[model samples]
Target: SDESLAEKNKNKLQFIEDVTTNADDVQRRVLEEILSRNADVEYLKRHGLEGRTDRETFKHIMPVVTYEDIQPEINRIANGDKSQVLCSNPISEFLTSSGTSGGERKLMPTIEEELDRRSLLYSLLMPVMDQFVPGLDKGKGMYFLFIKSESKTPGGLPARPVLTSYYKSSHFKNRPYDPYTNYTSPNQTILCSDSYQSMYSQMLCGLCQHKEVLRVGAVFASGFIRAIKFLEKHWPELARDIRTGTLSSEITDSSVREAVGEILKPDPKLADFVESECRKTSWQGIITRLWPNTKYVDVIVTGTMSQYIPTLDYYSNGLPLVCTMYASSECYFGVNLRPLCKPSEVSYTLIPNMAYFEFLPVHRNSGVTSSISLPKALKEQQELVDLVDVKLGQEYELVVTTYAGLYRYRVGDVLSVAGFKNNAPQFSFICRKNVVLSIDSDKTDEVELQNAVKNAVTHLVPFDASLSEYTSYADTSSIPGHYVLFWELCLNGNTPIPPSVFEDCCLTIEESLNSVYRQGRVSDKSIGPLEIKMVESGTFDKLMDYAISLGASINQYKTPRCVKFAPIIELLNSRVVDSYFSPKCPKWSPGHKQW
Candidate 1:
């Protein structure tokens, strides 16, 4: 018998609580299960494990590896090697990474069980949201979910981004509609491959039943903003289609037309409402005004996504922003227990059973590399802490043992333990390892650059303009190179922002950087003045479209904080409308300073 929605939610909640409450024991047993199940695999057998699965023995014997360390193994599998090469379970598909790391797309292996883990993570998100937001179960969410086209590997195995693989799978395509999970767009539209067509259909379907739409979401905050931007431009067309009960002739995809056309109905009231709201000069609170029943906005607001919170607040007029989970292409790691918390304070509690996690302790100001890359003497001194043993406020690089055959793999993510959720440790994402901009000695990572941008963008508010998107480049063509920040500002009025304002913004960013960067600007004299290049509005969107054309997934794409790809750099450079350099070097003094 099909269980009641309440019963299903209860079961999911119990699953989280049970695993987290005894996370220590569960993690230990999870390691045991992984080793016993895959001990015969060639990857482990070659490592001299001898079928032993003890934690201490495994930790001592196994090396903490990186993607490059196991590239040979992955290459073999891609060329039609059997599952026993790296894992006992057959590789179902390859999940392409979002290419945030060095602008390189990596193919991560996945098994049938890995998909189950993803489904479990999805089921838990809405149930947790329902606990805080009442009446969510009674309405649908306007989630802008799109799937990318998949290509075949040399061996004929499917390779695509993780989200595309999930959407195309029987698990997502065949799942029944339930209270915990219901979308404004049907599965057909989400799988349409053409993102613009899919978005147009989803928007049409969402607007047709605006009253039933309780929440709006996208996989990332940037995508949600893009959806709203799409609405702003096409609201008139949408109104016309709503009043006529006809699909737009622009929607060429037959599947999208059919999926959205069935939901279209002549509703002059909604058409007039949408037109009225969109016609307003001050369009703040457009989300709530258009969909009055919406309780909050849901998306990932951690990491670089946090930079968009100010813009999201401007659009929603202070609707609660929910960040649901912490995950990556390698594996689904954890969930954010407090979905409605402030963007700065959001922390994710790792689900102990999802994967076997180990953290290598990192101290402040120390450049910690993975154990595999360390010198022999330093490698022997390295120690990894288990999932339950992480200390609060301490930083560590994540190491995972996944069912997908990644063994003690360094995911290259650095996170700090925030607190304890039951017995499980909660973590705040720090940054990626080696994802930085370096001209000489100073290294500027993603988080630091985001903070600098956050501080600098405030200078635009007085002029009624806001920063829409930004990416940096370490320009080294000269004798002493400089950092160049490309910014796309959303100017609200015709009055041009004075050159002095941009110069001030540039200096503000330079001052906001880490002490090392500031020192380089002042005392060391190796770094040149920081520069801000303002690009035309909508330039970043074009960048995204170009990236998607190069096989990047729209669902999981995040703007790279630091530009690396030649084409991406050329695109940004071509759109520059104005440029300004720092007026003066950022003030710094060499002394006993807390940095």
Candidate 2:
């Protein structure tokens, strides 16, 4: 057994090395291509180019890139010639992202090579699975929480693969030998088939009827949380049926449900109820009901920053939460490799071998040029510079070349390296390149908000009177300029600071962090004065329950730092409304009074 374990480790380490080294080669080749096309050396020679020129050199010269740098290129690629930008070798498919900001879906080019690599990379999950789940093949069936797709698009891409399928295909080599079986049909599930609401409903109903055979697999954390909140809001009657095993048969009519029922052997009434409400249930309701049942859960995975970490821990009962490094449509660069393994290692671990990595420094240009033409001062200046040119401990934009034909492209993720992994460095996620808010040209990032909040609460009366959790909501209901901070505090002593005092403390911290906050302290358009709303003790528990009621696994949800418009606001509002107004508010609710 020890030998076998050693062998497994060997294979995994080899795989890592191979992928990492292969990624390096790819980066070198891609950088060379960029240099050749731009005549960068000659151009730089004209400017007396110095420092590194190889892959390391490119890493040094290129400044961290942002979405603003790539968005125009994306538009050009989409509307103009594809070959002009994306270096697709036989460009086959384009995947679309939700494009939350502009509301226009971004068509990300997926080349044949990229598709092949994705398929292969996913196959690598098998080894990790073998290490983590010893009897995975023999375990209960794996039920995908997300929609599955059967057919490929006209361009020959399967509508995004179910996360499980993607993992199975990319990471694991011996799928047939794995203990767990998949409940959803590999060929029948559709990708992005419904809105977040609809999909939540389907998954919940599917889970209840097949609870016996369907082992809950990894959940996409934030989406799962949203779904859970929706479920709690409705408190669907199906919840009783699921618990009592009296769901109706009508729900079992669907191919997926019928198969699930056969496996779980749930109460006939439970089957019937599911059948009856299958069409009417919302995705949110489904997630809410499916939150508990730790026995069946496997793991939880998500992207984005550590924002969701607190919420996820509360709900998931501290189950391992894996934060994968892959970015959507833009790039699949690295993975966190169990970000929650050590509290101190919350930052994502680089998948050094998987991607061709480079960084660009972020600095405001010092030279001023005339507006009428290229500033004579900038006439000879270069636009993008590399990482070695970067000041250590500073944030930089990440650019990546994946097997997907993306070259010297900015992926819009701002990251700071904690340190290096060989030549490949370990980096900390900073924020989204495009998501930074600029109030009257005063730019603010998620990090700034996090820091200000951290600083404000660090010195409460007692040393332990720290901010346990928090989230920022940009109030657009009245004016876009207003922002609100929702926080939970851990009191060290009996003394509680008045809301006004806490607000002042937060303001002081914000002013210290950003000069704009100092001016905005007096201006209506600035930080807009911190509004501290304290949650009733054990409010987080209710939120967890609320999250689960929506379908979020307790383990994967994170307490968010920033809440932007619409759905997130609606969810937060529902919680506040229920807390103060509903008969079910914890004070009066019939359930556990742990709070």
Candidate 3:
């Protein structure tokens, strides 16, 4: 078994390396293969390709479209039309987007082949990780993985988050242990539909075997941070259970309780150790104290998720944070070649065969420049740049041509080319296209807002306060409407922070914003001073609970950078402790143009 597993890992690593080295040719062959297999489908037929698989024809005839453009076709397939409307292959199941920003879950069609790609993407993660952190196979991973409740479509197909789909797949369910890693929690605990109970069971199981835990992580940095906070609140109960060798009565799910009960055993020594470490006045480096064998924290720390790095560092006490991949509901794009790189230096190399990768070059005017300028009749036929042509230091909007039903679809993710891994381009995720806060001709996106908040939070460091959660609002309800930010802070003590420090934070955030926003507040005077309102602790937990109630997946949830829903906005406003505004306008020097 060891020999076979070793061979499997070696083969996977070799496959990725070879494909990336010949990325240009591999990508072309992939596109040709996809076209050959699906040219008979309604989507390509309607584009007047006449069964042609050539790049030029597909470029000129196939229009680059968004989710809205293909909704009707998706609807047709969802309604059981089943006539190869999008993909020639039979639709296996549907994967739902996390839908954090829009609050609308989109159903993307998938085929069995698509699931294979997802599985391959996962299989590559551990091999890459083992290269940096050797002997990870010696211990297990306490991953805070969760499962969302799946809803049935009218056509009798199951729809759920992409992570849920992957976890539920036969590949993941059957092959829990690979060569390098396996999960600490049982499959039943991860599959439990109840979030509260599922988390309790997983935490209990992980605590029982704390010595074997080589790493602790969740799908995103937020979820991993939540796990630490969960440990803080329930360590006493967890210790009691471990002392008695009994499953907690709080876990009501029969299956989860049974699965976790199998592995649960009494250990008063372990229980005492957990309790003693948790009882410390300061929780800094609590992870390392509890799980001294932990090699690193493995979770995504890129794009909007980067804001959580400081909080992670506070808990990890300088442990490596590995950001492993770049992915979406539409397709799993690539893997981080250097998994142990500093969080800020992380980038993913495109797996050329994962999908027919394309990039649309983005301009500083907040625009895209298609390579081919089309005639008036062919205005929508804008040709996107192929992945092989992507240049370092240039930003582009990602467009995917997946093995699934999605064709020439704009995924709305913006990424910058970081460098090269072999012939393949490595990318640093920038931000989502439409997730912006705009007021008076100034456009500030999620990444910009995150950097601004990051700089401002440094002021909190001296006061022994760290940002727990934050979300912003463009307060347009008032004339000369300005930005309103809600912050939840983790206070270390009762140290009183002067109002001037908070005001300085507000100014520093404004200074960190883009020049356009600065010019609007300083020169045009159309916007009011920036404001930061600190909310009571646990306010974001309430927000997450509310979001889960609205049918969002707990596993895939990310805190939205901007809040727009009215009732949610009201929930945030009700928890405000104190508010501070910028003392003066942010300067707009000539050199302060877009970066």
lDDT of 2 by residue, 54-162 (tens): 6655544544343454555454444434343434243455554423223223445565445455544444554554555454443344334553222334333433333
- TM-score, prediction 1: 0.74
**In candidate 2, how many Å is residue 237 off?**
4.6
Tell me which of candidates 2 and 3 scores higher on lDDT.
3
CA RMSD, predictions in order: 14.7, 15.7, 14.8
Which ranking of candidates, highest TM-score first? 1, 3, 2
Backbone clashes under 3 angstroms, per model: 0, 81, 0
Q: Check candidate 3 and list the clashing pairs.
A: none
> Which candidate wins on TM-score?
1
Taking the tens digit of each residue's C-alpha lDDT, what string does model 1 give over 3-119?
Answer: 477777778888888888999899899899999999999999999999999999899889888888887888788778876977899998877664322223456888888888888
Give per-residue lDDT, candidate 3, residue 133: 79
* Model 3 whole-model lDDT (C-alpha atoms): 0.80
Give the candidate number with the greatest lDDT. Answer: 1
Worst 10 residues of 2 by lDDT: 578-587
